[PDB]
Design a protein around this ligand. Structure first.
Ligand SMILES: Cc1cc2nc3c(=O)[nH]c(=O)nc-3n(C[C@H](O)[C@H](O)[C@H](O)COP(=O)(O)O)c2cc1C
Ligand SMILES: Cc1cc2nc3c(=O)[nH]c(=O)nc-3n(C[C@H](O)[C@H](O)[C@H](O)COP(=O)(O)O)c2cc1C
Ligand SMILES: Cc1cc2nc3c(=O)[nH]c(=O)nc-3n(C[C@H](O)[C@H](O)[C@H](O)COP(=O)(O)O)c2cc1C
Ligand SMILES: Cc1cc2nc3c(=O)[nH]c(=O)nc-3n(C[C@H](O)[C@H](O)[C@H](O)COP(=O)(O)O)c2cc1C
Lengths: 343, 343, 343, 343
């Protein structure tokens, strides 16, 4: 019986080995960007509206051609068998049952085809490989398996400096592997090549699926993403795991939404920890959010049923926040105003 | 012998059962809006005037056709028998004796007619019921009993998520009931319907009493309230108990006062804890404030006499603050300027 | 051997009875304005100049017709025998020897004529008495005794609410009296009348000495002071002892200096604790500062010799700060720019 | 195996005598400017760019006619034998091997000619001596020994008030001397004269080497430096060791870069503690940074090899930060935008 997402973090801390909790919790460098993701959300206040018709409040959205139950997807998180033996299958099953898109990772610890077979109209996250030809094979596999969007991660030319992982001497256990094919940082520097705008065009030409660029923070990169034919972007500093000192996505979101001016979907992530945070993101103009660490807390704590409980809690919090703010729909929530405060 | 409102909180904490203290103290979600009500007041500084005539300083105001001794009313707080056996009668008697309006609640634990019989020209707070017909019956009862204003609460389409109450498994004791007719959250979701602008018009047509909309935060909702024929509004986030992340009323007050441009009374609440806080609210343009939790601290600590002592202390602090700031009247206090500082 | 003013506070805390330390240290209400005086100074940063001629750095100023060794006077502090048996005589002797003006108080615990006989061209602080005639007698006594300015305190229509003094049940010991004629708050409410602009004019007509209005915070009150014929003002919230929530003087100083546009001397006080703080005040446009509590710390710690050591330390810190900032004179320091930072 | 610069501070604290750690760590006065150097950097966030070509990322710059491996030089720090017996020779050897300029101090504890003989194309820091003739002798010695720039320190007309050193009664041990010729503060007040713009011109006429003015904070002093023929400036508050309350250099840097408009190199120092901090400085417009205390931490911890490890770590962090931010060159990093956040 969890009444907040924070209840799940406490539960996950109890069960996970310290080094795996640190792999999950940590960020790069001094963790300034990790902390700032939370600080930035905490400074945003919503100006709610009153006395509106709430006889049919709905939290649903249409995105990338599918109805989703909430303005929320499960973020790509590598190697989910680190957290629970059922790994990605547990999370994908719960997401399917909740009507929430699940992002299958390039570095999934269960093969993308197995996770796709769970159903639920999943997305696929791409890391750019050694060459155009192989990268494009994963994309084609994902499309053949029924994935509905390609989430191209664009903020990882290589992995950031994870000092918790370095200090812990973290490496994957023998029983966790990259099923589609700091020791994890060394492996990435060797196996993956930096993506460029040319890589984006190669992907866009290889699939009719919407291509979503994850890790955009500069306004002109958002504009360029639209010009490049992206169907969406995720405004994100990769949970503070990449450039330490990168601005939080939530701080760039409003300016990016204005610049994009409806030319693509604009998602955000980093520190979303409640339905109220989802409302803040929506009020700043997001189409939807991604949620990362909390989904893994729930997986660690109680497997598939833990993820189900998390998604049920988030669904209740989103409905609650929307109605209290006078919003019968997510579109109405996007028209809310906000104020910055001091915390 | 209390010299500050904070002395009363300490006293109430000692006497009340933990779960009832939590029902009183708590807010929704992470309590961000609860804390922000205090932070927001603490950032406001007054620019006092000197060398003005203070030979007849008066703290009185005229509001809703009655002279009040202070620019202050007792906020609606449900179920006052939770805090002291005399409940609403103790508070209403002290308010009457102090010349302060008392707001009788829809969810009062003593009937509205009994509390009105105490005297003191009380107000009545309305929650919108299952249908127009019954809602309007409470309004007519209140008017027949001599209530002088209808304070229509507009920020409770349903009750917020009170995590202290959920964790405590809080429910009303058998000896406390809704005398006019989280377990308290479940009861509200079943018994009350979301109010709309149509509900406001139904009330306005049913009574000649001034209708005051409590829980307005958006500037256009304040304008619309005036257009709808409201006699007042209370700029309020419901003490941080409704939308977690709602802006504090004190942060919207100046902009609302400007937009309303004298078309209705503009009250504020949330975190008023001293006569100096009353002065800040007045300087930002409020007609008057409501005070909630501190009145219940005083009731818990010492019953009717506790509430009397609280109101005497607040009266002294308001007079002190006004005179130190060069204000012989509340109208002069409204013309004070303020500065935001850092705390 | 004290190397900072903070060394003196530690020393005074050791020696003074708790209730007398609290009478000295405390402020009104929640002490928000007391704390804000420090916060406000800490947020100000100086932009120093380099490579200027420092062959004859001088900290002297001319003010109210006298050369002073520093841009600094000892603030009026009532009842100095509370802190040391020699009281005002010890402080006045040290101030004289340092070339710093000393402000003799209406509520001095040694008669104004005795303190004036020490020499050093002192100032006299006036509280407005029961009637024009008696007030004007103190003014005439002060002038006859050789005081060179009248510092009319304008922010005390009555004494603020000193909760430390109330809680301690503070009263003057039998051996400390008002030699020119909370128990101290009760005594003031009875003996003194609120001053007005008419009182200022009565004083201005009664003496050719410069009249300095102490406790101005509003820009139009500063302008009006010039129009009224004041020779100076002290921009001040009375060390956070009067209106709790009054803006710090340091936050109003720049705007007041601009509005006054050389029409009178503009002093500031509240929280000056180093030569660097004096430099900040000067850079914001002050003619000079007053220093209150630290002078009493020094008096408590070591009598006349303690005050001498404090003034020597402040003199060294002022010279140091000025030269490091490229200022050969106080006038050059007034032309420094500042930046607000975060602390 | 250090993974951050903070690992080195912990190591240095363990080994150094307390008073020498304090000589190194401390600042003047209350250490407000020392702390502000860190606060100021922590508030700056970078807006990284994505999807750029990173096939040949280079951290090199050209400055004062030499290629440097990083946009970074070792700051002038007096008396390095305080920290390790090899002192300046250890640091200079490591800097040479890393391709980083080393600044030889006027108050070096090994003679400038010995340190220059190490190689690595060093710079020389000048304090203005008793007269033009002797000052100019050090300059000529430095030039004859192969130093490539003169870093004229302009913020030390005398040494600041180092309260840690005063409290510790710090003095140099007998075995540490000024090899080119608070007890250290007393020695400086006697031996050195305040520099002026005339001193700058005397130096500029005495050498063809670029003259770099270290300790500029005012925009017009930066402009004047260009007009005076300076080849560079270091925007700096001397690590918070000079004027307590001086603005951090990082807070003035952008405005200075705009005013200078390419007329000289603009360096910054104060609190640079990671490659991410170097990126922030570059994004604000710096040509390069200086690093002071961390180099001494490394020297204290492990001598020459410690400094080598520090420089290798900084080089890795700079490359990491640049690439994550989409910058193949330091010039691209200078074109990054930043956002101020709250911490
Ligand atoms: C343990 C972990 C692994 C991750 N792996 C990936 C990945 O393979 N691909 C990717 O695009 N993002 C990855 N992310 C980033 C997340 O998708 C997301 O951007 C980030 O966690 C911020 O959201 P949060 O604060 O909700 O966790 C990972 C995050 C974590 C914590
Ligand atoms: C225990 C409790 C019960 C309340 N019940 C009601 C209510 O029935 N109707 C209403 O409009 N507001 C209600 N309120 C909100 C108050 O009227 C007021 O808006 C809020 O407490 C903020 O003021 P404060 O910080 O002075 O407590 C309640 C508040 C508390 C703490
Ligand atoms: C114990 C005490 C007594 C004071 N008495 C007087 C007074 O009689 N008249 C007056 O104008 N100000 C009085 N002041 C105010 C000071 O003159 C000054 O405005 C204030 O202390 C702020 O300066 P500080 O922070 O340097 O103490 C008093 C202050 C203190 C602490
Ligand atoms: C122990 C110590 C000695 C220093 N000596 C000198 C000096 O002789 N000349 C100079 O221009 N700066 C000197 N500095 C200032 C540094 O060059 C640099 O401006 C400052 O330390 C800020 O950088 P940091 O935060 O990286 O230490 C000294 C700094 C320290 C800590």
């Amino acid at each position: 019986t969890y009444v907040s997402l924070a209840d799940l973090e406490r539960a996950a801390r109890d069960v996970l080995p310290g080094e795996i909790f640190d792999f999950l919790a940590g960020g790069s460098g001094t963790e300034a960007s990790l902390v700032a993701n939370r600080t930035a959300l905490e400074r945003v206040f919503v100006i709610p509206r009153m006395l509106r018709d709430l006889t049919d409040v709905t939290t649903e959205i249409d995105i990338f051609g599918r109805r989703a139950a909430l303005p929320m997807a499960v973020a790509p998180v590598a190697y989910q068998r680190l957290f629970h033996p059922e790994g990605e299958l547990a999370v994908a099953r719960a997401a399917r049952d909740a009507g929430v898109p699940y992002t299958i990772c390039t570095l999934s610890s269960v093969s993308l085809e197995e996770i796709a077979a769970v159903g639920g109209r999943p997305w696929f996250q791409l890391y750019w490989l050694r060459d155009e030809k192989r990268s494009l094979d994963l994309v084609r596999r994902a499309e053949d398996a029924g994935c509905e969007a390609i989430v191209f991660t664009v903020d990882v030319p290589w992995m950031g400096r994870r000092l918790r992982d370095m200090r812990n001497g973290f490496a994957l256990p023998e029983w966790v592997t990259a099923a589609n094919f700091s020791a994890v940082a060394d492996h990435t520097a060797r196996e993956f090549a930096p993506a460029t705008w040319e890589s984006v065009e190669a992907v866009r030409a290889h699939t009719d699926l919407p291509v979503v660029l994850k890790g955009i923070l500069a306004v002109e990169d958002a504009r360029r993403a639209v010009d490049a034919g992206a169907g969406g972007i995720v405004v994100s500093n990769h949970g503070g795991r990449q450039l330490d000192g990168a601005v939080p996505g939530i701080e760039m979101l409003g300016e990016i939404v204005a610049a994009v001016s409806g030319g693509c979907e604009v998602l955000v992530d980093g520190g979303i920890r409640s339905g109220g945070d989802v409302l803040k993101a929506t009020a700043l103009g997001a189409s939807a959010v991604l949620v990362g660490r909390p989904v893994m807390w729930a997986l660690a704590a109680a497997g598939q049923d833990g993820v189900r409980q998390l998604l049920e809690l988030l669904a209740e919090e989103v409905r609650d926040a929307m109605g209290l703010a006078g919003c019968e729909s997510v579109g109405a929530a996007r028209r809310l105003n906000t104020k910055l405060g001091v915390v």
